[PDB]
Every structure is written in C-alpha cells, then in structure tokens.
C-alpha cells in the first residue's frame, strides 16, 4: 500500500495473507468470507506470463495477522487449502477480466477478536455504494512504493472513480467486471495498492446497516500511485453468481 497508514488492531479481521510454503514468503492478500472460504484474485494463483500456477499444497493462508513478518503466536491462525477454484472465464491473457478465485480451507477457522468474515454485497448495497466519489478502503502488506516493505498491515481509503476517467487513464480495455479507484492529480491526496497487495479487499461500510462489505479485489495498476493512473479492482457483485455457484456446489 502506497501512502497508507498502519492498521489499528482488529481493524480488518477478514484480512488474509496467502503464504508460500517453500520458500516461505508472502504471495498475496485475500479475505475471509466464512469459516471455510477465502476470496482472492485469480492472478494470485494463476498467471502464466510469470510462470505462476499454484496447487493447493503449495500454499497456506494466515488469518488474524497484523505484523507482516512475525509469527503472531496465540493470535494468527494458519490454515491449509482443500481446493482452489478459479473463475472459468478469468482472462489472464489480456487485462485480468474476472480476476477472482476462491479457496476452501481444509478445516473451519475459529473466529476471534482478530478473525471475522466480511460481507459480500447484495445487488442493492452494490447499486447504492458503487458510485464515483464514494470511498472504500484497501488493506495489505504489499510494497510501500513502486520502486520498501511494511512492518504491519497498511490501510488506505480511496474514492471510486467515474468509469470514463478510468477508461481514459489507460490503453487497456476496461470491462464491466472492473472498477477503478484513487485520487486524481488535481485532488492533492494520494494512495494506491501495490505489488503484494494483489487479492486483498476493497471494502465499504454500509451507512444503512453498519456492516462492512467487500466490493472489490485488488487486481492491477500501471505502476503504483502514479499521477493520472488508478488502481483497478475486481467487481465482486458482478461475479457473485459464480461465487454462490461454487459455494453451493462445493
């Protein structure tokens, strides 16, 4: 996260770290959506341009974390993966269209003060809150700058941007399965996701019912925090029918 701040304890109890077993290293962010299901970006698991194609046994998820590098004894919980599910129409060849994946845990995780699931949006909450200017919150342990790394989870609040502005910021084709967020050059304020924040959540707090909803997944950006560029996020609600199908089937 560029131009963010240290999270408060328990501020993002749905935060998940995707962790490689060997070598032991951070792979991505992710989020807890139930006691057995974790949501992430497809490119965290499958990205052939970079020779990335993980299997379940390659990976662990670490839940309840605050420190990036410490083993947070008696606080974090480490879970093994039963199965990865990648969206069947995930477009890794072009623009990361439908950049979404689910991971089922081998055993349910116990909730605690530090471990708690985020909500997924219904159609009405998405329609109400997915509006230009409305701010969400992005969290992760990724790099602090494009060109270093945080001691603890970082948090930044960023406004959703008008779709024509998102489109006009890039030569990449933007789809309805994406939205973009970030400040404009003339807005003064800054902030973005960066490398290592992939797969973590973009959340919004509903003013109607007080609950946090995951509207986006950290997907891609041209650099990090560049003037005139924006961060692009998977549109969770647009892909919720797939999410529901996977959970209902498996």
């Amino acid at each position: 996260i560029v131009e963010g701040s240290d999270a408060e304890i328990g501020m993002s109890p749905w935060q998940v770290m995707l962790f490689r077993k060997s070598p032991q290293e951070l792979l991505c962010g992710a989020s807890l959506i139930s006691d057995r299901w974790v949501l992430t970006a497809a490119h965290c698991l499958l990205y052939p341009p970079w020779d990335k194609n993980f299997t379940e046994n390659d990976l662990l998820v670490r839940i309840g974390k605050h420190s990036r590098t410490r083993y947070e004894r008696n606080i974090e919980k480490i879970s093994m993966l039963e199965k990865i599910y990648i969206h069947p129409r995930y477009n890794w060849r072009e623009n990361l269209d439908r950049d979404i994946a689910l991971m089922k845990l081998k055993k349910p995780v116990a909730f605690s003060d530090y471990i708690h699931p985020v909500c997924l949006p219904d159609r009405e909450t998405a329609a109400s809150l997915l509006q230009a200017g409305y701010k969400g919150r992005v969290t992760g342990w990724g790099n602090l700058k494009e060109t270093g790394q945080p001691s603890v989870l970082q948090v930044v609040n960023l406004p959703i941007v008008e779709r024509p502005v998102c489109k006009d910021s890039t030569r990449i084709r933007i789809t309805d399965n994406m939205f973009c967020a970030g400040y404009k050059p003339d807005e003064g304020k800054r902030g973005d996701a960066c490398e290592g924040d992939s797969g973590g959540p973009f959340v919004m707090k509903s003013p109607f019912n007080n609950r946090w909803y995951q509207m986006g997944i950290v997907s891609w950006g041209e650099g990090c925090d560049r003037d005139g560029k924006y961060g692009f996020y998977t549109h969770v609600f647009r892909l919720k029918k797939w999410i529901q199908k996977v959970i209902d089937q498996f």
């Binding site: 962790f19 032991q24 662990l60 083993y71 093994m80 790394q149």
Partner: peptide
Amino acid sequence: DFEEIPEEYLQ
C-alpha cells in the same frame, strides 16, 4: 525476512 512458522503447518 519472515519468522519461521511452526513445523506442524508445513507437514
């Protein structure tokens, strides 16, 4: 740069 995690999770 990461602290080692318990061996039980890697078995």
